[PDB]
Design a binder for this molecule. Structure first.
Ligand code: ADP
Ligand code: MG
Length: 259
């Protein structure tokens, strides 16, 4: 969205590597507004016109959104070099790697909290008529308070049967993906279907196989997963319902006691 003048940006250091260039952290001080810490995606020089457009497309997409569970876009730098995409800063980075570094360090209530935010963000996106198509733990960022937000607006084992076979992507297929994500979270970053091959995964799902309950996962959360993994997309829950279901679990914590 908004075009930012390089004079307002002061890069601090490298915090990650994107496919289009380095990812940094830094300060943003717009005229009048108060300085803030941000994340800065840069484009490697010598880029092709296609690379430039694809890179900036990500900003155009997320720029059209605005929700606490969707990565906030501060703006972009295109008039001068390097080209940049400034966004919200998420100290804990990617959710999957984040969970791997904290194996079994959270309560069911915390995990459910993370899943609720992701659900709220997807509910928002669905209402805005946006189909992510690539929902997965690696595409969700987490901050200090553990708030998870959907990212990557620029994967067999994560995709619904129909989407894989007929390339039919809908919010419904995102619900299936959300199911896999729920598994990833309760598994603390474990890879879905483990070392199974992508083809094995396809044949397994065909044979009505479904990922088992992750360790210490309440039977109520695994059932919600199954619902998300229903062969018939029309039967899968809506993100709105997924949210309410999660909310009900928060009301009466004893509903998560049945292991
Ligand atoms: N807003 C952000 N705050 C903190 N770290 C970030 C942020 N965006 C990206 N990163 C870090 O940079 C890495 C690469 O960025 P990512 O957006 O996942 O790449 P791409 O979407 O280009 O494939 C992430 O795995 C994460 O650790
Ligand atoms: Mg990524």
């Amino acid at each position: 969205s908004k075009e930012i003048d390089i004079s307002c940006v002061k890069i601090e250091q490298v915090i990650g590597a994107g496919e289009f260039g380095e990812v940094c952290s830094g300060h943003l001080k717009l005229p009048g507004k108060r300085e803030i810490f941000v994340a800065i995606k840069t484009l490697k020089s010598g880029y092709t016109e296609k690379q430039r457009r694809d890179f900036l497309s990500e900003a155009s997409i997320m720029g059209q959104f605005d929700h606490p569970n969707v990565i906030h876009l501060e703006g972009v730098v295109t008039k001068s070099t390097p080209v940049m995409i400034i966004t919200e800063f998420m100290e804990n980075g990617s959710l999957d790697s984040f969970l791997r570094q904290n194996d079994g360090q959270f309560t069911v209530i915390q995990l459910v909290g993370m899943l609720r935010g992701i659900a709220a963000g997807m509910k928002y996106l669905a209402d805005m008529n946006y189909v992510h198509r690539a929902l997965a733990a690696r595409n969700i960022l987490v901050n200090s308070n553990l708030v998870c937000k959907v990212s990557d607006f620029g994967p067999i084992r994560w995709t619904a049967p129909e989407a894989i076979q007929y390339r039919k992507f809908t919010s419904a297929s995102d619900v299936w993906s959300y199911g896999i994500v729920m598994w990833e979270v309760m598994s603390y970053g474990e890879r879905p279907y483990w070392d199974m091959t992508n083809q094995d995964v396809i044949n397994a799902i065909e044979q009505d196989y479904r990922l088992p309950p992750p360790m210490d996962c309440p039977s109520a959360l695994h059932q919600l997963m199954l619902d998300c993994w229903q062969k018939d997309r029309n039967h899968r829950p809506k993100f709105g319902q997924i949210v309410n279901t999660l909310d009900k679990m928060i009301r009466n914590p004893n509903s998560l006691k049945a292991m």
